[PDB]
Amino acid sequence: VDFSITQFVRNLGLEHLMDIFEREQITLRVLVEMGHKELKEIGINAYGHREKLIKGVERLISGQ
């Protein structure tokens, strides 16, 4: 069970997407490599939500 993705997604205010991440067995390490194509594939349908996740990963990486 990956708790690090739950924390990352809650911080973005995207906890409504956790049902998708859990069903798709997405860990934080896997999410980090997902772009618009991959996120649209798993059902993250709104461009603004995908951008929030993608920019959220860039900032998590650049911040560290």
Numbering used by the authors: 874 to 937
Which text from the study accompanies this structure?
The poly(ADP-ribose) polymerases (PARPs) Tankyrase (TNKS and ARTD5) and Tankyrase 2 (TNKS2 and ARTD6) regulate Wnt-β-catenin signaling (Huang et al., 2009). The two Tankyrases are highly similar (Hsiao and Smith, 2008, Smith et al., 1998), sharing a set of five ankyrin repeat clusters (ARCs) for substrate binding (Guettler et al., 2011, Seimiya et al., 2004), a sterile alpha motif (SAM) domain (De Rycker and Price, 2004, De Rycker et al., 2003), and a catalytic PARP domain (Rippmann et al., 2002). Tankyrase polymerization is mediated by the SAM domain, a small helical fold highly prevalent in eukaryotes (Knight et al., 2011, Qiao and Bowie, 2005). We report crystal structures of the polymerizing TNKS and TNKS2 sterile alpha motif (SAM) domains, revealing versatile head-to-tail interactions.
